[PDB]
């Protein structure tokens, strides 16, 4: 049953999700890495904790880099918005960043909407 056909221009159907979002969605869902990246109650977004530690172990584990700015940059091309729920300043609030990336085509039980989340056709779609 050939759903995978050659030359997918701007198509979506047989897992046209880029490798980044494929790792990412499962990363948020993963119980080991849940400590440093966990989904919001709705499942439409995800939070990232300890930017330095996450970038140190989690990023070279799922992705092929340790730099966090690279991870965030991909998401800006995917249309995700950064929302920080920790008011970072002279407060007694926890010693971590709350880094929530939100997207309407990113749901916790919708892998087929990750290939509706596109970066560009001039590279991997």
mmCIF file of C-alpha atoms in Angstrom:
data_model
loop_
_atom_site.group_PDB
_atom_site.id
_atom_site.type_symbol
_atom_site.label_atom_id
_atom_site.label_comp_id
_atom_site.label_asym_id
_atom_site.label_seq_id
_atom_site.Cartn_x
_atom_site.Cartn_y
_atom_site.Cartn_z
ATOM 1 C CA UNK A 1 0.000 0.000 0.000
ATOM 2 C CA UNK A 2 2.158 2.822 -1.411
ATOM 3 C CA UNK A 3 1.171 6.070 0.332
ATOM 4 C CA UNK A 4 4.863 7.122 0.248
ATOM 5 C CA UNK A 5 5.259 8.530 -3.310
ATOM 6 C CA UNK A 6 8.217 10.407 -4.861
ATOM 7 C CA UNK A 7 8.393 14.243 -5.075
ATOM 8 C CA UNK A 8 6.188 15.544 -2.177
ATOM 9 C CA UNK A 9 6.027 19.232 -3.249
ATOM 10 C CA UNK A 10 3.695 20.841 -0.616
ATOM 11 C CA UNK A 11 1.897 17.533 0.185
ATOM 12 C CA UNK A 12 0.909 15.953 3.535
ATOM 13 C CA UNK A 13 -0.345 12.405 4.259
ATOM 14 C CA UNK A 14 2.301 9.624 4.817
ATOM 15 C CA UNK A 15 4.255 11.131 7.812
ATOM 16 C CA UNK A 16 5.555 14.296 5.990
ATOM 17 C CA UNK A 17 6.673 15.561 9.465
ATOM 18 C CA UNK A 18 10.343 16.920 9.511
ATOM 19 C CA UNK A 19 12.727 14.909 11.822
ATOM 20 C CA UNK A 20 12.862 17.858 14.322
ATOM 21 C CA UNK A 21 9.074 17.799 15.129
ATOM 22 C CA UNK A 22 9.051 13.984 15.038
ATOM 23 C CA UNK A 23 11.643 13.901 17.902
ATOM 24 C CA UNK A 24 10.159 16.987 19.683
ATOM 25 C CA UNK A 25 6.500 15.787 20.004
ATOM 26 C CA UNK A 26 7.690 12.368 21.340
ATOM 27 C CA UNK A 27 10.255 14.232 23.593
ATOM 28 C CA UNK A 28 7.480 16.197 25.355
ATOM 29 C CA UNK A 29 5.469 12.913 25.625
ATOM 30 C CA UNK A 30 8.561 11.040 27.029
ATOM 31 C CA UNK A 31 8.557 10.316 30.902
ATOM 32 C CA UNK A 32 12.435 10.490 31.282
ATOM 33 C CA UNK A 33 12.672 13.975 29.688
ATOM 34 C CA UNK A 34 9.235 15.085 31.138
ATOM 35 C CA UNK A 35 11.249 16.694 33.997
ATOM 36 C CA UNK A 36 12.851 19.257 31.569
ATOM 37 C CA UNK A 37 10.062 19.307 28.891
ATOM 38 C CA UNK A 38 6.336 18.621 29.576
ATOM 39 C CA UNK A 39 3.022 19.407 27.762
ATOM 40 C CA UNK A 40 0.410 21.931 28.975
ATOM 41 C CA UNK A 41 -3.027 20.448 30.292
ATOM 42 C CA UNK A 42 -4.706 21.030 26.845
ATOM 43 C CA UNK A 43 -1.723 19.487 24.963
ATOM 44 C CA UNK A 44 -1.571 22.396 22.437
ATOM 45 C CA UNK A 45 1.838 23.589 23.758
ATOM 46 C CA UNK A 46 4.933 22.455 25.754
ATOM 47 C CA UNK A 47 7.130 23.978 28.517
ATOM 48 C CA UNK A 48 10.954 23.734 28.759
ATOM 49 C CA UNK A 49 12.786 23.884 32.137
ATOM 50 C CA UNK A 50 16.502 24.473 32.881
ATOM 51 C CA UNK A 51 17.521 25.808 29.364
ATOM 52 C CA UNK A 52 21.207 25.028 30.105
ATOM 53 C CA UNK A 53 20.647 21.414 31.356
ATOM 54 C CA UNK A 54 18.030 20.612 28.653
ATOM 55 C CA UNK A 55 20.441 21.943 25.987
ATOM 56 C CA UNK A 56 23.356 19.959 27.579
ATOM 57 C CA UNK A 57 21.770 16.407 27.667
ATOM 58 C CA UNK A 58 18.323 16.468 25.973
ATOM 59 C CA UNK A 59 19.124 18.350 22.717
ATOM 60 C CA UNK A 60 22.200 16.080 21.658
ATOM 61 C CA UNK A 61 20.039 13.042 22.725
ATOM 62 C CA UNK A 62 17.026 13.642 20.374
ATOM 63 C CA UNK A 63 18.503 16.302 18.035
ATOM 64 C CA UNK A 64 22.171 16.563 16.786
ATOM 65 C CA UNK A 65 23.287 19.748 18.687
ATOM 66 C CA UNK A 66 23.771 21.173 22.267
ATOM 67 C CA UNK A 67 22.943 24.839 21.373
ATOM 68 C CA UNK A 68 19.440 25.948 22.616
ATOM 69 C CA UNK A 69 19.261 29.021 20.266
ATOM 70 C CA UNK A 70 19.260 26.529 17.318
ATOM 71 C CA UNK A 71 16.258 24.605 18.832
ATOM 72 C CA UNK A 72 14.213 27.817 19.390
ATOM 73 C CA UNK A 73 15.163 29.134 15.854
ATOM 74 C CA UNK A 74 13.598 26.044 14.185
ATOM 75 C CA UNK A 75 10.368 26.635 16.194
ATOM 76 C CA UNK A 76 10.220 30.328 15.020
ATOM 77 C CA UNK A 77 10.286 28.947 11.391
ATOM 78 C CA UNK A 78 7.569 26.412 12.461
ATOM 79 C CA UNK A 79 5.454 29.374 13.724
ATOM 80 C CA UNK A 80 5.677 28.526 17.495
ATOM 81 C CA UNK A 81 5.492 31.490 19.943
ATOM 82 C CA UNK A 82 7.663 31.773 23.102
ATOM 83 C CA UNK A 83 5.572 32.433 26.274
ATOM 84 C CA UNK A 84 7.430 32.710 29.643
ATOM 85 C CA UNK A 85 5.191 32.067 32.740
ATOM 86 C CA UNK A 86 8.082 32.799 35.180
ATOM 87 C CA UNK A 87 8.288 36.608 35.649
ATOM 88 C CA UNK A 88 12.131 36.684 35.540
ATOM 89 C CA UNK A 89 13.584 39.393 37.834
ATOM 90 C CA UNK A 90 14.028 40.273 41.537
ATOM 91 C CA UNK A 91 11.406 37.704 42.720
ATOM 92 C CA UNK A 92 11.467 34.650 45.086
ATOM 93 C CA UNK A 93 10.100 32.572 42.085
ATOM 94 C CA UNK A 94 11.921 29.206 41.114
ATOM 95 C CA UNK A 95 15.505 29.353 39.723
ATOM 96 C CA UNK A 96 14.451 28.019 36.250
ATOM 97 C CA UNK A 97 13.035 29.363 32.963
ATOM 98 C CA UNK A 98 9.467 28.411 31.959
ATOM 99 C CA UNK A 99 9.736 28.259 28.160
ATOM 100 C CA UNK A 100 6.295 27.504 26.600
ATOM 101 C CA UNK A 101 6.125 27.179 22.781
ATOM 102 C CA UNK A 102 2.467 27.292 21.586
ATOM 103 C CA UNK A 103 1.028 26.224 18.163
ATOM 104 C CA UNK A 104 -2.631 25.470 16.922
ATOM 105 C CA UNK A 105 -1.357 22.595 14.677
ATOM 106 C CA UNK A 106 0.556 21.030 17.638
ATOM 107 C CA UNK A 107 -1.772 18.700 19.652
ATOM 108 C CA UNK A 108 -0.749 15.866 22.037
ATOM 109 C CA UNK A 109 -2.744 13.165 20.152
ATOM 110 C CA UNK A 110 -2.346 14.596 16.598
ATOM 111 C CA UNK A 111 0.901 13.424 14.896
ATOM 112 C CA UNK A 112 -0.710 14.141 11.439
ATOM 113 C CA UNK A 113 -0.931 17.889 12.328
ATOM 114 C CA UNK A 114 2.907 18.048 12.788
ATOM 115 C CA UNK A 115 3.101 17.782 8.927
ATOM 116 C CA UNK A 116 0.657 20.727 8.799
ATOM 117 C CA UNK A 117 3.426 22.526 10.798
ATOM 118 C CA UNK A 118 5.835 23.491 7.957
ATOM 119 C CA UNK A 119 9.207 25.333 7.923
ATOM 120 C CA UNK A 120 9.827 25.878 4.126
ATOM 121 C CA UNK A 121 9.673 24.060 0.729
ATOM 122 C CA UNK A 122 13.106 25.598 -0.221
ATOM 123 C CA UNK A 123 14.626 23.126 2.354
ATOM 124 C CA UNK A 124 13.008 20.068 4.110
ATOM 125 C CA UNK A 125 9.232 20.857 4.187
#
